[PDB]
Amino acid sequence: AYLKWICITCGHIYDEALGDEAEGFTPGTRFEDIPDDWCCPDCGATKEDYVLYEEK
Numbered sequence: 001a002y003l004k005w006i007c008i009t010c011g012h013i014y015d016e017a018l019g020d021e022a023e024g025f026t027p028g029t030r031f032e033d034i035p036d037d038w039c040c041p042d043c044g045a046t047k048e049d050y051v052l053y054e055e056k
């Protein structure tokens with residue numbers, strides 16, 4: 001059950017089964033294993049801007 005995260009900063013949803021394609025988010029990367037090193041592909045901030053969509 002891949003979870004998704006929405007960046008409250010802009011409103012971008014992340015699909016654990018399809019994260020970023022330019023950085024290299026292979027299909028199967030849970031936000032848990034993605035520390036702050038990863039940022040938003042539309043903004044460029046830390047992970048604090050991303051939250052869990054439903055099922056929290």
Ligand SMILES: [Cd+2]
Nearest residue numbers: 007010040043
């Ligand atoms: Cd964002």
